[PDB]
Structure formats: C-alpha cells, structure tokens
Design a protein around this nucleic acid. Structure first.
Ligand code: FME
Ligand code: MG
Lengths: 82, 164, 88
RNA sequence: CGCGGGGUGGAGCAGCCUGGUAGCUCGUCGGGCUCAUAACCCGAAGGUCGUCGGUUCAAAUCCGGCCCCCGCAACCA
RNA sequence: UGAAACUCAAAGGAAUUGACGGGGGCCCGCACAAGCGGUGGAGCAUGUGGUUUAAUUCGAAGCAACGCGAAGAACCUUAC
C-alpha cells in the first residue's frame, strides 16, 4: 500500500543535518518535528527524537526499519485499556 | 421439556436406555421402536446430539405430565409479612398470631415486622416483648430464622416452619 | 482491686462458663472490671457478671481463697493464667 | 467428640431420593417500550453442584474422609 | 353541646376561556390493519453516548439530537 511515485520523501531539516553528521561519525539525539520523512539508510545507527505532538521521543535506528516513515516509531496516541 | 417420541426418531442407531437406567446398547431405530411398543412406554430421545442418541424408553406424554405435576408441587413457598403495632391491642395480636400459625401450616414463611415511629426509648423493648412472645406462642409450628432485628423504623423477625 | 490466677474455666455444651481463680493481692467484687492476660498478649478485657463460691455467694473474695467467677463474655475456655482487676 | 440434616449461575430456593435429562424467582448486563424513571417484555451472560476421590458404560445423584453450616448433647461455680 | 392556642392569606362558590380524560359523538392521516421491503442479528461505513487522552474543540437532546452544523478535518480548515 506504500505511497510514492519516484524519489522517496525526506524533509531537508534532518536530511541535510544527518549527512553532515556522517562526517562527524555518529551523533547524539537529533530532535526533529519531521515525522513525514521516510527512512533512508544514511540515518541507520543514529538517534532520532521524533515529535509526538508533545515529546521528542528517541528512536535508535536500524537497517530493518528503512521502508518506513518516521512517525510510525513515534506513538502519538496513548493507551487503550480503560 | 421436549424430546423426540418413538417414530419422530430418524437418527440411525440409538442408545436404548430404559425407564429404570438399564442399557440395551446401540439398537437400530426401528428395533428400538418395536421394543418400546412391546413394553408400551415410548422412545424419548433425551440426548440426540450425543454418543449413540440417548433413547429413554418411557411414555413421553406421561413423563411430561409427571414433570408438570412436580413443578406445580414445587410452586405451592411464599414469605408472608405480619406488621404489628408498638402499643398493642390484644385481640388483634391474637388474630395476627392465628394468621401466622395458619401460614406456617400451609407451608409459607412469616416475616414479622413491628411498625415504629420516632420515640426510640422503649420501642425496641416493646418490639422484643411482642415478637418474642409470638415466637413462644407458635414455637411448635415455627423456628426463628431472623431474631428481633432493628431496621430504624421497624423491628423484624422471621418465623420459618419447623419441618419443610 | 485484685490479682487472680486462673485454675479452671468451664466448657459446658449446656450451661455456661465459670472461672475458678486464686486471689494473690486483695479482693474481687461483683461489679469490678477484669483484664485477662496470657504469657505475651492479653486474651480478653471486660467485667464480672456472676459470683458464687463453694459455700455461699460471698460478696468480696479476700486474702487468697479460690473463687469461681463468671466473666461477662468470655471467649476462650479451660485454664487461663493471670486475671488482673482494676478499680479506683 | 455424639447423632441428625444440609452445601447448586451473584441472593433465596427445586432437582438428588428414581444413574444419565441442572430449572424458578430476585439481582447483573444489553435492548425495547416512555417524553423520562420505575414497572413491564424480550434476549444475553452466568453453576460443575463444598471438596478429595472412587464407583459406573456414565454420579449434583451411590459411598466415605475432611471442610463446614444448622439443630439437639448431661457439668458448673 | 363545643373551643382556643398555633397557623395560612388564603379555604370557597358560580360561571369562562382553554387544556385534559383508560367521557361521548362526528371525522381525519401509511396511525393500525392488508401488503411489500427492511432495521434490530453479521461485517464494515459513518454520527453520537460513554470512557480514555496532552486534547479527543464546541454545539445539537424524544419525535423535531444522532450520514446533523460539516456541501469534503493529512497541513490548512481548526476553534483543541
Ligand atoms: C479452683 S476451682 C474453683 C471452683 C469454685 N470454688 C470451689 O469449689 C466453685
Ligand atoms: Mg428500565
């Protein structure tokens, strides 16, 4: 069901940030409001703090989660049990 | 309260249990029917969705009637409330006692309450005097389930028949 | 106004309860308060209901004579230990 | 300890007794009906029959233990 | 035979206009009947109630609120 024509979408907020940190090796906690962005393997390894709408929640990123947008790993709604 | 009767059974081979509790085994339907006819009492399929369909060789209608009778017996058993006053007239009290006795004889429980007002000084005492006296009078028909108990504006007791 | 030692409490499947007690201190009257103690924890606290000795129903039990006493609502029967009675 | 009887959807009761077959009323949940609540009517859920076990083709049911409840059981000074 | 204390700013009658009746009569409407096809049973689609949440924006209340304001909420809209 995955939705894009050609050229998979990453926003130039963290896209150009993480490639700079490819030269500093790794980095520590990149808080972005960008959850729209799909995972490219340039990010693989880093720590992305993604905006819940409230919390910049940390994500330790692996090669497996590549074909996914960032906000999937940021659970915005909480709880279900009553 | 309804089961397949004698000829209403189509299910091939039936568990031929008698009116007593005796097993003949897994006879054919027709054979079982014949047996029933011989013995008079019908073949009542009391468990069709079981390991061999449970055919009970009793008169179905008769059985039903018996059950109905039993149910009726069970029915007739009630709780009957007698409501005493605090400052008691004697004749009335006697009448109430008689009523209670009658109820007991019939088979019914008697809930004996005493209607209180304000004035909670000698009211509970009065209630005790009444209810206990009543119990004493009719101890041979009834035993006490609920002792003289305070409800605030009432004193309740329960007279239940000696043997049910 | 007395310290008593428990000798025989009574288990009746008919009548009631009677506590035979040896006085060590002073006197046990009929309208006195009672504390019942074991070796560690206190068993029961309350009052004296009934008083009736072997001879006659003596009002005060002086010196150290054994006297039965009925203890308001006694829950634990047959051989206690120390009964202490307090009164101002 | 004695003897007798009992123990069942949450509550009060039948069924055991006759070995196969678990009902009834009150409550709980949902609906309807009403303007709305009760009442009413409907459904829906809910018991393994104190339990250990046996029996027997199969036990709430027959038997026993233990657990209990209940009644009676002769001693208070 | 017959009070008062106390208490209320009324208790009342007759009629009148209505409204009302498991009063009456005369009528009517898919109101029932007669008939067809559904909803309630299933899944989902919605809107609400309720409950969660950092917020589940607010309103609409029986018919005449509930596929409604919304005749187009990813952001916008959007008020949270
Ligand atoms: C110490 S036993 C006490 C019993 C009591 N006195 C005497 O017999 C009655
Ligand atoms: Mg209702």
């Amino acid at each position: 069901p995955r939705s894009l024509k050609k050229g998979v979408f990453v926003d130039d907020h963290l896209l150009e940030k993480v490639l700079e940190l490819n030269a500093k090796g790794e980095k520590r906690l990149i808080k972005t409001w960008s959850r729209r962005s799909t995972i490219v393997p340039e990010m693989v390894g880093h720590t992305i703090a993604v905006y819940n709408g409230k919390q910049h929640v940390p994500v330790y990123i692996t090669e497996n989660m590549v074909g996914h947008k960032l906000g999937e790993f940021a659970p915005t709604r909480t709880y279900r049990g009553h | 309260k309804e089961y397949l009767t004698n000829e209403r059974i189509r299910a091939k081979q039936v568990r031929v249990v008698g009116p007593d509790g005796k097993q003949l085994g897994i006879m054919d339907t027709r054979e079982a029917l014949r047996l029933a006819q011989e013995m008079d009492l019908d073949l009542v399929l009391v468990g069709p969705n079981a390991d061999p369909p449970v055919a009970r060789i009793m008169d179905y209608s008769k059985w039903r009637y018996e059950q109905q009778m039993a149910e009726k017996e069970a029915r007739k058993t009630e709780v009957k409330s007698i409501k005493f006053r605090v400052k008691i007239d004697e004749h009335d009290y006697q009448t109430k006692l008689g009523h209670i006795k009658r109820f007991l004889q019939e088979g019914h429980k008697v809930k004996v309450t005493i209607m209180f007002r304000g004035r909670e000084v000698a009211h509970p005492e009065l209630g005790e005097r009444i209810l206990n006296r009543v119990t004493e009078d009719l101890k041979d028909l009834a035993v006490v389930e609920m002792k003289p108990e305070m409800l605030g504006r009432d004193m309740n007791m329960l007279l239940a028949p000696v043997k049910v | 106004l007395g310290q008593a030692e428990v000798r025989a409490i009574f288990r009746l499947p008919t009548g009631k309860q009677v506590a035979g007690c040896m006085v060590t201190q002073g006197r046990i009257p009929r309208n006195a308060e009672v504390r019942v103690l074991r070796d560690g924890q206190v068993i029961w606290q309350g009052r004296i209901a009934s008083l009736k000795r072997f001879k006659e129903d003596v009002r005060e039990v002086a010196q150290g004579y054994e006297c039965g006493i009925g203890l308001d609502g006694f829950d634990d029967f047959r051989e206690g230990d120390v009964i202490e009675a307090f009164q101002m």
